[PDB]
Amino acid sequence: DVEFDALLGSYCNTLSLVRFLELGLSVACVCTKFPELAYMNEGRVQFEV
């Protein structure tokens, strides 16, 4: 008697690492680096017209 229970398949999907500066909604925002924003109670912006 000859018998075997065989293993035939294993597949992984790609996990797409999608950056924020790719999509079309990057246009409306100007993101910029500022550390220590946790330390302020106000860093808030004042503008003329």
Binding site for a copy of itself (CB under 8 A): 12-13, 15-18, 42-49
Q: How many residues does the chain have?
A: 49
- Shortest CB 13 distance to a copy of itself, Å: 4
Contact 43, 37 (CB under 8 A): yes
d(CA 41, CA 9): 57
Which one, 6 or 28, has the nearer CB to a copy of itself? 28
- Shortest CB 17 distance to a copy of itself, Å: 7
- Shortest CB 18 distance to a copy of itself, Å: 6
CA neighbor of 20 nearest in space, from 5, 30, 35: 30
